[PDB]
Amino acid sequence: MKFAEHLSAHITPEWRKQYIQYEAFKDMLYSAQDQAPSVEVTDEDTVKRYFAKFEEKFFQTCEKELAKINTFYSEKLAEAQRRFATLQNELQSSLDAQKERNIKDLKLAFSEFYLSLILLQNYQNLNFTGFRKILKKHDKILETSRGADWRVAHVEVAPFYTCKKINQLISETEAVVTNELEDGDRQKAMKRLRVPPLGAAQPAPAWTTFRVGLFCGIFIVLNITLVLAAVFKLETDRSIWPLIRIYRGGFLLIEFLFLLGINTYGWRQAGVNHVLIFELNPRSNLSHQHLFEIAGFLGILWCLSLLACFFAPISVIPTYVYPLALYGFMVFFLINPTKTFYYKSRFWLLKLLFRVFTAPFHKVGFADFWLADQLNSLSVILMDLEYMICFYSLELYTYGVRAIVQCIPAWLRFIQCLRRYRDTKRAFPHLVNAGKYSTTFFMVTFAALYSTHKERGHSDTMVFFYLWIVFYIISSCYTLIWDLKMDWGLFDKNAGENTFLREEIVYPQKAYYYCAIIEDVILRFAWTIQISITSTTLLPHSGDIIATVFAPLEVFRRFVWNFFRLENEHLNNCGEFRAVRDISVAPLNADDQTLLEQMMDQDDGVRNR
Amino acid sequence: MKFAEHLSAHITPEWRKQYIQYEAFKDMLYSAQDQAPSVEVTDEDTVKRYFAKFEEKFFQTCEKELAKINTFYSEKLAEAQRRFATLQNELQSSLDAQKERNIKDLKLAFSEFYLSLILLQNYQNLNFTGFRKILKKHDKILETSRGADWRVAHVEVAPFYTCKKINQLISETEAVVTNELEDGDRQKAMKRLRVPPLGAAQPAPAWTTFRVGLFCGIFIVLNITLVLAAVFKLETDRSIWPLIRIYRGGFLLIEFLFLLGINTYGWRQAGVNHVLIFELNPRSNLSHQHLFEIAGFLGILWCLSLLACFFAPISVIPTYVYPLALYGFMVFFLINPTKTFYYKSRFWLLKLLFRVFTAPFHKVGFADFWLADQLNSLSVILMDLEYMICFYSLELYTYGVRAIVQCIPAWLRFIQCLRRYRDTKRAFPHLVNAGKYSTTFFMVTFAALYSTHKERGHSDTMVFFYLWIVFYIISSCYTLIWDLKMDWGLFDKNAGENTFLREEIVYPQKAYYYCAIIEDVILRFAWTIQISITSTTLLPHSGDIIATVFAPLEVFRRFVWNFFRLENEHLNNCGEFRAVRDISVAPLNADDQTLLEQMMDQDDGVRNR
Amino acid sequence: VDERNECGQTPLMIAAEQGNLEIVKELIKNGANCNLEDLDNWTALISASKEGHVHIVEELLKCGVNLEHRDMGGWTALMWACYKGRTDVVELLLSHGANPSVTGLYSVYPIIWAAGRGHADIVHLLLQNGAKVNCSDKYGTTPLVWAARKGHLECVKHLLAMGADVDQEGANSMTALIVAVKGGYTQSVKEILKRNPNVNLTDKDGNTALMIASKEGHTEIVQDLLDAGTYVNIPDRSGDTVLIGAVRGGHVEIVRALLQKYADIDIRGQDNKTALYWAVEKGNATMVRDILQCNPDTEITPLIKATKMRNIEVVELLLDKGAKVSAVDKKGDTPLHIAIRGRSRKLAELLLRNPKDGRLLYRPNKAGETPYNIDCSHQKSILTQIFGAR
Amino acid sequence: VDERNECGQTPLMIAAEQGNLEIVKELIKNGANCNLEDLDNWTALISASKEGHVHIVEELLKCGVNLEHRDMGGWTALMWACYKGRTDVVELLLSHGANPSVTGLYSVYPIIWAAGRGHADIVHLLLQNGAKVNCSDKYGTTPLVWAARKGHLECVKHLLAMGADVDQEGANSMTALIVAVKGGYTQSVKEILKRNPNVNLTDKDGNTALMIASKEGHTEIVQDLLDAGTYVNIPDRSGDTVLIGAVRGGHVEIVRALLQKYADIDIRGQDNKTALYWAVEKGNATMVRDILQCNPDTEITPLIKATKMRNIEVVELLLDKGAKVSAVDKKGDTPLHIAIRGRSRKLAELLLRNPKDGRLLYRPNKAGETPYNIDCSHQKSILTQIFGAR
């Protein structure tokens, strides 16, 4: 029904159940048009009785929808006035206590109340528009002016159209917040109220939370079992290394899903409209509980497979079957053809993976960017899958295959950037980004050549070491600056009070931003050294331990990056993915000063010239 | 504020936040009275200005409360009309589908809607009563008729007092259910609608459910660990029997709490107003999630102690410390002086235990009955606690001590029944019940004498066996008949269609009742044989195994008994604990036929004689 | 100065009926408190207002007395004067300032009693003194519903002159229009309809104004509601249409009026029943002709019931439409068997006008019962009827 | 017969502004199509209704013309006729059947324009033809608020004759009473108050009617609001009370009017400020006397400002109530130093009537400051005369 571009994400399904059935009315009109007997075949009486039959049903339906809208609007208006009274009482109680954090929570409550008022204004406007279009179509199709007369007689005098208390409540809320929650300042108060929490007024389904608890408990006890089994049951005269890489890939996947659930929670509460940026379906999206539940389920499977590897559950089944069973079940749960077990999200993810891997052919949305960059962060999973294939194919680095596997994610985003260069034709945010994902290629290639030529012992080995170190520092500095400037939006010249930040800050505290800056610096350097070390056969002592301990750190950096990049996308629209910068919830315009300067003198001026 | 006796349990705290602040108004009036300067000390002007100061604040407060009531009533009226329209649409859709279980759920939804309408009628009546009393007290205290004039000017013309759409909605709901959900029948429809689900419109706190999931997961994994450890790690040349009795007591306690949570869920959904019968606080009671969480927590502790007994976690700490630590923590969590960890329920339970154990001194409420009978069911926990004391005192049946421990719960309820005989002075439900709990004494005593005299080998051993068997059959039959007739209310002569049941049935299906009858028969016989076997030293082969396998069955029987006894208490008030039989939610009376037969002829008759 | 005969009744009440100027002056000379109440919280003022002479009411009004007194039931002097209809005394009380806005203990106001009893002049006086018009009874019954219940034209006219609401619903889910229609008061219905009521509102049973008017048979009310714009084919829970109700009740005029304004005919009633089905079942020739002239479908069935009825004019009218013979009943019985065993000679020559109808019996065999054996069993051959018919 | 004048404008509309009888007669003699509209959606009727002669309006009334025509801005002939005030022409348009309920593209109705412009006669004519009275603008401004904004007594009287609601809130959270008070139209305020308004409502800034009337200085409006039953001590957003505002403004009559009705004085304003504090700061004798005569608290300090002001009558007023001297300023400066250097000889013997005051410096020693150093430097010390006297 095309509610809006930003309000659509904040609208609860129970809100959508109370709008006019535009599609149903149009289908009814088209059914009346399609089944109409003709004057040529049937006489006028038969046609007239058919149209009377249709009009009676049509107007009964219109009366029912109008009554529904009136009743729901009355309920929501009463709720809004009651909540405004309660909030004023709380604010006055706080002021009386102080004169003779709760204040931040109270500003948040005012933001949610403002969002409710905007949604009710939307409720008035779109329902009136729907009635007007439906009755205009009725007039066009049946050639009778009964639609317009009925609209004038009933719709235009209905309470939802005429009651203008919502505008007054909006103005009073703005005045209250401006003059009482902050000092005299309207820009700051409107800036705070214009970004309400995206989380609409529905709790968890009350069974997803229970399953999250179930899987968290099983996961905690299984981890304790893993720790005890590893401490006591230790192998002898065998290499546990082939198992640790496989379960490392599994662990990074599970941890990424958990941290992505935390990211969804952070975006939803802070106000970042990730639904619009990701271009998700505004109806039936996933909160953080669902992601936590999926992460817990895969963690249970991973822990069970690892315990089966440590113990000997089934004598006939060998040890290497358990990783096979684990990843077979994971991939089947990813490519399940049926409609069960998160079919919507699973199919969305499959479509997104198809568009990411065949990058230049598909137009680059925001989701393709986000998931290609997540692949840039999670390349260790791809490498461990490659190692699993190698270890299960050759037995139980053919020719630079590992280097290609490392460079696959960087190549995907490199070619996406070039495709966006072809499409948009702007060299600033695209070719620079491509240069970044090519410096990653240079890093990997020179590390591999250094590893190969260290065996030769030729004097060119030091030249390749110098090339590796210079490209290491270049890629680290390049990615760090690009992150903190274009991907995060920090270090802006416009901010005066936020110091080394930008004008608009969504998250409640600033120390988050600073600690994120430091961790992002040290962890980008660690990520680059991890790529270099894992791409080189320098020494197996630190190798396979540096990567193992630094990969979860890399996923940590990536989810922090997720927070701040989505915040930048909401605020400063750093990517040209949508042709509207302003997503923040704002009401319609008000020009009461235009009635002033009129009503008193010779207005005139109605003529064009 | 004394809302009602039955509606109080159905009232959500958000409903209570919107009533008139009767206590606040009375405190304000008393503060005005207490601080009034006297005419003797101060002149008339000082007194007049003080009363003006008081009256202005009083009337501002009254205006705010009146506006609050108007707004909340408007919201709830709109909600009621919208829900009625939605329910009619669903019913017509179902009828159209059928002509060309959801019906039971739809009757349940109509029951909840009817409950909402009754609550809103209560909202009108009690708020008007509160205003009338507050303003009458104002008139009495300050000797000015401004209260009555203000009431006439504002209160009596307010929408909440004058809008009589709620009565019309009640009548239309009754008509709709009578003529459409059932065949033409008003008694059946009113019987169904008059017992709405007690569960008010609030979900779980969304963290209790998560903790229930956490503890359930930990408990499942710990039980799997217990099973594997017992199967593989088996003791040799030792008696595991001292541990099994202790952990049997713990297990019965945990299982009882879990099943009691299920009982609370069943009562709450089916419509049994257990809050009033138990005389719990209508505000801040416990749903089933809290009981599940407590049961899970104690299960985690019990499993951890049992695993510590199987394994050897700490070398210095011996095995027998773990049961000590477990029960020390349980009892401390029961007698925690602080306000944390369920302080309200913990203190209520402590008070109830104090009143139960010192039975004849305290008046017998319903809670004393219920918990004494639960002790009759859970005497195995008391016996295992006694065995723990014996096993930790003598080392690592002195003189009939075990028999006394078995007879303690039966004695508690025997003396409660005699106390109620003294109080109420009715011999039918009291002395018969006392005879029952004395036949239990006879069973235990003759079983113990049989055990003692079997060692002697005297011919009196067979006489004591005959006494034991006759008292076994007498007690089993006596308790069975008493249960199924007075404690459950089944086998009534009034029921014609429910066959071997009574007129009023709360639970949705009848097969529940029948299967409960059969299980109650076989399990009362099993309970009696368990008491007899555990009270006798006949043979250790079946002993300590018969009791172990039959105790959870006994708790099963007791929670089934809980369901049906609370249902009987709600419906037929079989115990004289409250002086009102009718708890079922019903509206005020309507006599529109009284206006008829008037308004048309010479009414007269206003004189007394 | 009063003598108690254990009745607790003041001399004023007993002497009010036989009021004489000289004895009243003698009694008022013997000064006694007029404001004294009675054993049942009554007052001699109530007796004076009930039937007392104008002079005694005027004299009791004089001097300080409790004019606004409440009786046992809370009915003031004005309430009893309005209920027990008397334009005078009411006039004096209203002109003296008696409160019209007083509320009875039964939550019934004086205007409601005046309207229900039908005292139009008292209603006019109360309205002119500012008595609240849009008030409600304890069930929400406005005075308009009470006045229109018995069709008091003058009371309804006077109350609607002020502008009383009509959409407001009274007791038992009733509006002014519905209760006026129930009593069959045509001019009251016109008066209510003149102020744009919401005609489509439902009563307690769910029956609208048109359905009740049609079932009762008030042709004028039905036509007025139709002119008002009533939604014709709203179905009752019984599955019946207002046209079905009109045709079943035996109301030719209402059927024609419901057909004049385009109403559906092919509606599916209860247990596979249509308006034509009910008309042919009752066999009313005019109703069947009127329904058929408006082009319904004969399939939704009248064929077997019409054959069983065997009325000749129904058969001719239904055959003129062109209903195919081989339609059979739900039990499998062909209508041809019952049509033939009745020995309808008049239909014989009429059944020789169509090819399929001319073939008639030899065409269908559904249940397997061969009719040729039965025909040959009859001594008088049916084939002679076909031979001689043409 | 068509002439392209490069403007798309017929000569009739161009000549309408300079309307003359001779040109109208000449144009009507040469029969031309009068029904022609304008390229800019105008009409000769629009210009006739703006200021044209009644003769041309009546002539355009003859023959088929679009009487209810919408212009470029959606303003009909009636809207332009009501806006630009002209009782006649409006008379003819209303009598001929022009719709008064037409709605402009600005959601502003003709009654709103007539009331805001103040043309009371056009408002009366519009009401007499059935124009809706309680209508609203697109911001919620009823015509009552528009009329009372400029305080048009006749417009407000005419619109309240119908019964327009007063509690309805107009644009920017304003009612009729609040805007009338802002405009200082006393008789308009009385007219509004005659119909029982809700006086206690707040404006956009939170100021009530009494607060605005007191700050502006309208004594009569203040007294009328007080008689209406205004809640006196509703606090301002700054925390000041209406009495505090009145005494600060310098309005003795408003202070007396607020004290006549029993209003609190010990109310606590912003940062330890009361009515007496502001009165003694400004030193108005009548204001201080009026506040003190009604027994306020002099404990909360007035001593420092009383000493600093040094006005003798303020001292005589404040000392009789019995304010305790041992209060000292929070700034650390003892009032005794300035009292001595200020040549307070007249107050000296007045300050020897109480024991504690007579003790003066011997009782308190808090900051260690001994004013005896300044006294020794002075050739003529005040306290030495008293010490040598007794």
CA distance D27 to D12: 8
Q: In the structure, do chain C and chain A come into contact, i.e. share 3 or more CB pairs under 8 Å?
A: yes
CB-CB contact of D129 with D94 (8 Å): yes
Phi, psi of D35 (to 5 degrees): -70, -10
List residues in chain B touching A: CB distance below 8 A.
18, 64, 67-68, 71-72, 74-75, 78-79, 81-82, 85, 203-204, 206, 209-222, 225
A212 with B217: Cβ contact below 8 A: no
Distance CA B388, CA C174 (A): 75
CB C327 within 8 A of CB C335: yes
Describe the crossing of helices C219-228 and C186-193 by its angle, rounded to 10 degrees.
10
Alpha-carbon distance B82 to nearest alpha carbon in chain D (angstroms): 27
Give the integer Cα–Cα distance in Å for A222 and C146.
Answer: 77
Q: What number of other Cβ atoms are within 10 A of residue C16's Cβ?
A: 21
Q: Are C66 and C46 in contact (CB under 8 A)?
A: no
Query: B76 φ, ψ to 5°?
Result: -70, -35
- For CA atoms B295, B300, B304, B306, give the dihedral sign: positive
Identify which of B598, B600, B159, B601 has the alpha carbon closest to the alpha carbon of residue C73: B598
**Whole-angstrom Cα distance, residue C33 to residue C23?**
17
Domain map (residue ranges) of chain A = 7-193, 204-261+288-304+319-329
D310 with D344, same domain? Answer: no
D-C interface (Cβ pairs under 8 Å ≥ 3): no
CA dihedral D264, D266, D271, D277 (to 10 degrees): 100
How far is C317 from chain B, CA to nearest CA, in Å? 32
Same domain, residue pair D356 and D376: yes
Q: Is B436 annotated as a binding residue?
A: yes
Instruction: Tally the domains of chain D.
Output: 4
Based on the number of CB atoms within 10 Å of its own CB, is A530 exposed (0-12), middle (13-18) or buried (19 or more)?
A: buried
Q: Is B373 annotated as a binding residue?
A: yes
Contacts of C233 in chain A (CB under 8 A): 53, 56
**Which of C200, C231, C264 is facing A49, going by the closest CB pair?**
C264
Q: Which of A181, A592, A597 to mutate to test the interface with D (most CBs of D within 10 A)?
A: A592
Residue at token pair 């003059």? A179
Are B75 and A82 in contact (CB < 8 Å)?
Answer: yes
Q: Which residue is closest to C43 within chain B, CA to CA?
A: B607
Are both D163 and D121 inside the same structural domain?
Answer: yes
Six-digit token pair at B150?
């203000």
Distance CA C323, CA C82 (A): 67
Helices (H), B573-609: 592-595
In terms of residue numbers, what domain contains D41? 1-81
Q: Is A392 annotated as a binding residue?
A: no
Residue B83 assigned ligand-binding role:
no
Q: Using an 8 Å Cβ cutoff, are A245 and A384 in contact? A: yes
Is D74 part of a structural domain of the chain? yes
> Can you state the angle between helices C275-282 and C242-249, rounded to 10 degrees?
10
Is A373 marked as binding a ligand?
yes
Of D324, D339, D369, the domain-final residue: D324
Contact B94, B103 (CB under 8 A): yes
User: Are the C-beta atoms of residues D92 and D120 closer than 8 Å to each other?
Assistant: no
Considering only CB atoms, which chain B residues are within 8 Å of C84? 602
From chain B, the residues in CB contact with A75 under 8 A are 74-75, 78-79, 82
D316 with D264, same domain: the answer is: yes
Backbone angles phi, psi at D338, to 5 degrees: -70, -30
For residue A283, the tally of other CB atoms under 10 A from its CB is 12
C207 CB-contact burial (10 Å; exposed 0-12 / middle 13-18 / buried 19+)? buried
Chains that touch B (3 or more CB pairs under 8 A): A, C, D
Q: Contact B72/A78, CB-based, under 8 Å?
A: yes
| Cβ D267 vs Cβ D242: under 8 Å | no
Residue B181 burial by CB count (10 A; 0-12/13-18/19+): exposed, middle or buried?
Answer: middle
Determine the longest span between alpha carbons in chain B, in angstroms. 103
Non-local CB neighbours of D238 within 8 Å, separated by 6+ positions: D270
Domain match, D207 and D309 both: no
Q: In this structure, how many other beta carbons lie within 10 angstroms of the beta carbon of residue C265?
A: 22
Q: What is the full DSSP assignment across B86-141?
A: HHHHHHHHHHHHHH--HHHHHHHHHHHHHHHHHHHHHHHHHHHHHHHHHHHHHHHH
A558 is in an annotated binding site: yes
A355 is in an annotated binding site: no
**Nearest residue in A to B81, CA atom:** A71
| Terminal CA-CA length for chain A | 40
Task: Provide the residue count of chain C.
Answer: 390
Return the H-helix or E-strand segment holding A64. Answer: helix A44-99
Residues 6+ apart with CB under 8 A from B429: B486, B574, B575, B576
- Cβ contact (<8 Å) for C140 and B165? yes
Q: For residues D110 and D208, state if they share a domain.
A: yes
Q: What is the CATH number of the domain that holds D56?
A: 1.25.40.20
Cα distance from C187 to chain B (closest Cα, Å)?
Answer: 21
φ/ψ (deg, to 5) at C333: -70, 125
Q: What whole-number distance in Å separates Cα of residue B449 and Cα of residue A240? A: 67
Method: cryo-EM
**Hey, what are D99's tokens?**
């719709």
Q: How many angstroms separate the Cα of D371 from the Cα of each of D301, D331, D363, D378, D382?
A: 21, 17, 14, 11, 12
Q: What does the block give as tokens for A277?
A: 């940026």
| Chain A: touching chains (3 or more CB pairs < 8 Å) | B, C, D
Dist. CA B376–CA B388, nearest whole Å = 20
Residue type, A280: L
Chain A residues with beta carbon closer than 8 angstroms to that of B209 = 206, 209-210, 213
A175 vs D contacts (CB less than 8 Å): 204
> What number of H helices and E strands is found in chain C?
25, 0
**Closest CB from D42, D83, D169 relative to A168:** D169
In this structure, the answer to whether residues D294 and D211 fall within a common structural domain is: no
- Domain ends where: D229, D250, D271? D229
List CB contacts (< 8 A) between C75 and chain B.
606
Q: Please report where in the chains the tokens 């689900």 appear, as a residue.
A: B197
CB C283 within 8 A of CB C308: no
Q: After which residues is chain A broken (C to N over 2.5 A)?
A: 100, 396
Q: Cα separation of A394 and A387, whole Å?
A: 11
Looking at the structure, tell me whether residues D118 and D219 fall in a common domain.
yes
Residue B530 host element (H or E): helix B511-534
Tell me how crowded residue C378 is: count the other CB atoms within 10 A of its CB.
10
Would you say B139 and B147 are in contact if contact means Cβ atoms under 8 Å apart? yes
* Residue D274 near residue D286 (C-beta atoms within 8 A): no
Instruction: Supply D334's token pair.
Output: 């003892």
In a domain, D357, yes or no: yes
D307, D337: one domain:
no
Q: Name the minimum distance, in Å, from the CA of B17 to any CA of chain A.
A: 10
- Cβ neighbours of A595 in D, within 8 Å: 106, 108, 137, 139, 141, 171
Q: Distances in Å between the alpha carbon of A454 and those of A388, A464, D142, D255? A: 27, 9, 90, 99
Give domain status of residue D89, yes or no: no
Nearest to A193 by CA among A165, A171, A174, A167: A174
Q: Sign of dihedral through CA atoms D118, D124, D125, D128?
A: positive
Is the Cβ pair A590, D139 closer than 8 Å?
A: yes
The structure tokens 């700061």 sit at: D281
Residue type, B24: A
Residue from A10, A11, A15 nearest A197 by CA: A10
Q: How many residues does chain D have?
A: 390
- Residues D221 and D253 placed together within one structural domain of the fold: no
Of D233, D294, D295, which is closest to B56 when you measure between CB atoms? D233
Residue B473 CA to chain centroid, in angstroms? 33
Interface of A with B (CB under 8 A): 18, 64, 67-68, 71-72, 74-75, 78-79, 81-82, 85, 203-204, 206, 209-222, 225
D239 and D200 both lie in a single domain = no
Q: How many residues does chain B have?
A: 609
Chain B residues with CB under 8 Å of D233 CB are 53, 56
Q: From residue B397, how far is each of A528, B394, C286 by CA, in Å?
A: 75, 12, 102
Are both D267 and D336 inside the same structural domain? no
Q: Is A317 left (phi over 0), alpha (psi -120 to 50) or beta?
A: beta
Name every chain A residue with its beta carbon within 8 A of the beta carbon of C231: 56, 59-60
Contacts with D97 (C-beta within 8 Å, 6 or more apart), sequence order: D67
Nearest of A378, A386, A385 to residue A409 by alpha carbon:
A378
| C380: its two tokens | 């008088």
